[PDB]
């Protein structure tokens, strides 16, 4: 192992861990990542990793809920040989899910409306606690851009069309932040495109 396994959690059911090996490795054969919740009568689960580069691998740890006191032990094996021992606390490394279904509405001449979906169900903590960042830019000129912070707990944004150049096409994408503690940015949504006019 070169760099040490690090993990993040979506605070629902999936934790993603990443490491980089030594030489070339096929992870789906050869390697196993064993994880176990520190909890009365728990059993160790086993995660078969997928390759994400020459010597780089990823594992998706399946989980019941995520509560802040949850702690896991992590054991990377290579057959009979133990390569790495560690531990992971999901609530110390939150990376929320990417928003989705990003849509631009061009049906009102003066004002653009962007909408998109919160990737969580109403009963998760994050559902009520997600901030968003909307990134707009001209398709062939990334230096002509905007960033909008959406903190009002509703996946929508409005802009005056007059704030963007006309006759040109723009792209847009959005990512999510938990506020929380120990959170990082989600992945970007897929992006959308429209031709700006007014």
């Amino acid at each position: 192992v070169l760099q040490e396994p690090t993990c993040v959690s979506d605070y629902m059911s999936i934790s993603t861990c990443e490491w980089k090996m030594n030489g070339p490795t096929n992870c789906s054969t050869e390697l196993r990542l064993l994880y176990q919740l520190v909890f009365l009568l728990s059993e160790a689960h086993t995660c078969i990793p997928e390759n994400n580069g020459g010597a780089g691998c990823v594992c998706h740890l399946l989980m019941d809920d995520v509560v802040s006191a949850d702690n896991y032990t992590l054991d990377l094996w290579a057959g009979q040989q133990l390569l790495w021992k560690g531990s992971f606390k999901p609530s110390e490394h939150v990376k929320p899910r990417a928003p989705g279904n990003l849509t631009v509405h061009t049906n009102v001449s003066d004002t653009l409306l962007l909408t998109w979906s919160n990737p969580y169900p109403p009963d998760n903590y994050l559902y009520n606690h997600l901030t968003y960042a909307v990134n707009i830019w001209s398709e062939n000129d990334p230096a002509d851009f905007r960033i909008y912070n959406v903190t009002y707990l509703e996946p929508s944004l409005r802009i005056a069309a007059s704030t963007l150049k006309s006759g040109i096409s723009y792209r847009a994408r959005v990512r999510a932040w938990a506020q929380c503690y120990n959170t990082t940015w989600s992945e970007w949504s897929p992006s959308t495109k429209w031709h700006n006019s007014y």
């Epitope: 919740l37 520190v38 909890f39 009365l40 728990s42 019941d64 809920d65 509560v67 006191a69």
Partner: nanobody, 118 residues
Amino acid sequence: EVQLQESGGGLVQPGGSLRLSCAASGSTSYRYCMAWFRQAPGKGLEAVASIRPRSGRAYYADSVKGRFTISRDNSKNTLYLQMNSLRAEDTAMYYCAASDNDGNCQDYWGKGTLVTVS
């Protein structure tokens, strides 16, 4: 300062079944761990089954796998232990325990219910 009171014990024939209950004086859903332990005459305490109250995810000792089921009704603040295919070996005092800050289940204890099998 959670309080726990078990009920539902009694004498049984080998092969027969039983259902235990444990009312809690506060929300089961705010507990981290909830479990059943038991103590047979002459022997030490042993965990039998445990549960994650929010999700319902349940865990078991080998000796009760296939026979016992742990469950909870969060709306009644209650924990259950359905005991099937009882053997003489299962004769013991049975306890519900809980903990809030660790998954050891050692913070709070009930008074116990005897389960006799002969």
